[PDB]
Amino acid sequence: FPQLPPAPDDYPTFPDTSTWPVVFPELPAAGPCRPPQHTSKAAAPRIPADRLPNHVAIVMDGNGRWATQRGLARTEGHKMGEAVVIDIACGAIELGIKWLSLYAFSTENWKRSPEEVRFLMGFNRDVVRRRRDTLKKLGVRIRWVGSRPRLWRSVINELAVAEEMTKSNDVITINYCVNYGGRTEITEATREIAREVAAGRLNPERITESTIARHLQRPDIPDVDLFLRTSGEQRSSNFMLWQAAYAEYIFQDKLWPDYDRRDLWAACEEYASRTRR
Amino acid sequence: FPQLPPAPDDYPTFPDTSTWPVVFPELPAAPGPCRPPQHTSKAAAPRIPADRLPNHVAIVMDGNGRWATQRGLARTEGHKMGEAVVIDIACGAIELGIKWLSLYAFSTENWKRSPEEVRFLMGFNRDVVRRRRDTLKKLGVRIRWVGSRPRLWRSVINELAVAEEMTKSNDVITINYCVNYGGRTEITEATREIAREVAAGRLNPERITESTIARHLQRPDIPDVDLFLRTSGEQRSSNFMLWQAAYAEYIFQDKLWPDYDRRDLWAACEEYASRTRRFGSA
Numbered sequence: 001f002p003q004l005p006p007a008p009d010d011y012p013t014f015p016d017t018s019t020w021p022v023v024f025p026e027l028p029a030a031g032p033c034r035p036p037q038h039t040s041k042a043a044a045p046r047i048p049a050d051r052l053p054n055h056v057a058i059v060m061d062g063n064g065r066w067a068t069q070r071g072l073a074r075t076e077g078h079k080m081g082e083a084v085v086i087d088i089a090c091g092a093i094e095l096g097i098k099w100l101s102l103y104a105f106s107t108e109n110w111k112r113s114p115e116e117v118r119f120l121m122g123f124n125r126d127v128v129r130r131r132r133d134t135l136k137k138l139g140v141r142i143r144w145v146g147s148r149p150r151l152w153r154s155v156i157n158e159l160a161v162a163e164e165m166t167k168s169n170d171v172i173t174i175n176y177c178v179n180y181g182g183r184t185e186i187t188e189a190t191r192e193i194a195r196e197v198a199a200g201r202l203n204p205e206r207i208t209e210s211t212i213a214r215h216l217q218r219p220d221i222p223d224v225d226l227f228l229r230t231s232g233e234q235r236s237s238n239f240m241l242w243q244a245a246y247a248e249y250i251f252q253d254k255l256w257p258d259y260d261r262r263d264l265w266a267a268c269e270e271y272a273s274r275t276r277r
Numbered sequence: 278f279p280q281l282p283p284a285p286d287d288y289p290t291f292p293d294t295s296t297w298p299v300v301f302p303e304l305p306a307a308p309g310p311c312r313p314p315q316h317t318s319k320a321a322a323p324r325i326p327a328d329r330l331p332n333h334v335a336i337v338m339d340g341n342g343r344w345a346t347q348r349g350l351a352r353t354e355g356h357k358m359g360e361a362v363v364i365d366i367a368c369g370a371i372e373l374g375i376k377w378l379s380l381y382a383f384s385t386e387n388w389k390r391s392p393e394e395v396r397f398l399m400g401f402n403r404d405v406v407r408r409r410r411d412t413l414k415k416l417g418v419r420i421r422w423v424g425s426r427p428r429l430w431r432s433v434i435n436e437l438a439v440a441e442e443m444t445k446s447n448d449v450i451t452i453n454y455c456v457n458y459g460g461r462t463e464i465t466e467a468t469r470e471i472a473r474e475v476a477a478g479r480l481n482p483e484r485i486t487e488s489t490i491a492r493h494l495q496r497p498d499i500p501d502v503d504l505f506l507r508t509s510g511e512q513r514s515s516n517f518m519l520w521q522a523a524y525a526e527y528i529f530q531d532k533l534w535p536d537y538d539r540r541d542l543w544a545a546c547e548e549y550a551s552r553t554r555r556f557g558s559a
């Protein structure tokens with residue numbers, strides 16, 4: 001039962017949405033720190049290890065519907081979404097999930113207005129810079145997954161720093177997927193394979209499903225167990241395409257800025273129920 | 278509105294599942310493909326405009342063994358009942374105007390079942406194709422196999438290869454009958470072919486694009502899946518049409534495959550046609 005037990009009543013909480021960016025609380029010093037509990041003070045459900053998803057992937061959908069209901073720009077929905085990412089990371093640690101893949105920026109987003117794309121590049125750069133120390137302290141290992149063309153060098157470089165600083169952590173790994181597309185990533189694995197073949201380092205007849213797996217950008221990513229998408233949308237949208245071929249999908253109706261760790265836990269309790277059915 | 282109109286009231290119905298194999302009725306001549314028999318309920322396809330219909334539906338046929346188990350029957354009986362369901366779905370797809378239909382008959386994962394289950398399923402798929410190939414031809418269905426050659430029985434490939442040759446000029450609907458199919462495997466096989474072309478100095482690695490992978494899949498004419506359906510409450514894509522379904526809409530239906538009929542296909546298609554299409558979606 002790999003859950004952290006309920007925090008003491010007085011242990012720090014997260015998120016305090018009275019400031020933007022939300023200020024992550026000081027924690028008592030431990031190794032990694034125990035993450036703050038949710039503001040509701042709910043505790044993670046008891047799910048046995050062999051029924052827990054090892055790897056959860058999340059498409060964080062609904063930020064513009066959320067902002068539209070409030071007469072705000074979509075960028076306000078993105079802003080509120082930053083604290084939900086952190087809260088979900090805290091929740092995932094409390095529950096004992098080991099891998100979390102987050103679809104921060106699809107290759108499809110290049111169709112959005114250039115002003116919004118520029119905001120999202122800047123914003124993802126800033127989130128990583130602003131949260132890198134908090135992630136390090138909680139024992140998160142983070143790194144970039146995605147494709148290089150068009151992506152701002154500053155975002156790649158900022159994740160590269162957070163990956164270097166968190167390389168030894170092992171409480172949870174977050175794949176922070178930026179300019180990511182599943183077909184694109186498989187096509188890059190195939191290009192790599194092709195380079196190795198043009199070079200005579202690899203025999204085409206030896207190519208198997210493992211060869212593709214070994215040549216993906218991050219070959220250490222395990223299969224996705226549980227694939228989640230918010231806002232009621234029931235598509236995988238090319239996210240973790242290779243890795244989620246055998247995933248279970250749980251499509252939830254809440255909009256991402258309204259989501260919190262208790263919703264992640266409820267999807268994980270459902271996933272654990274289906275290990276029986 | 279590319280639906281066929283409601284059929285005449287005395288137009289032949291299908292399926293009558295009181296006998297096995299199920300009888301497919303004689304149909305009046307055309308000129309041209311025959312109009313499919315209407316469902317036993319005589320329901321007519323809903324009027325969904327062409328711009329809101331899926332061009333390509335993929336279906337995993339789930340729950341055959343669970344269905345037979347609930348009735349205390351051998352699991353082979355659920356499979357046998359799913360044959361008429363495949364044909365009924367093909368007739369309802371034609372009535373609705375669907376142009377592409379992919380059916381997941383046997384997965385690369387299925388070699389993990391017992392030898393007796395595998396022999397049964399390989400032999401039963403061979404037999405379905407033989408039994409139904411003339412009927413599909415008469416309905417203007419273009420049918421062909423999609424899947425991986427290693428392990429797959431040569432008798433299955435042979436029956437599908439003749440069905441493919443018999444129906445190659447048909448154009449009412451294409452059915453990809455997917456047997457020993459695994460999406461990662463089909464991508465690996467495309468990557469092998471690309472690698473062969475590179476080793477032969479015919480393709481340069483820096484000219485490889487997503488299109489190159491698409492052009493080297495086994496059947497490169499298959500369009501993207503617009504609507505991906507599971508039955509029996511399964512909520513996974515199980516490696517089916519993995520490259521082609523990357524942007525599909527998923528609907529996970531509860532009904533077991535042997536209980537399924539063309540009205541369930543139409544209802545999933547009505548649900549798909551109603552979904553709001555969000556920013557940037559094809």
Ligand SMILES: O=P(O)(O)C(O)(c1cccc(-c2cccc(-c3ccccc3)c2)c1)P(=O)(O)O
Nearest residue numbers: 061062063064065066068069074231554555556
């Ligand atoms: O997924 P988002 O909520 O960011 C989205 O749905 C979105 C982004 C920005 C604005 C909206 C939007 C625009 C116009 C109307 C509405 C709407 C909201 C609630 C009820 C009816 C319409 C929502 C919707 P998108 O996938 O189309 O980009």
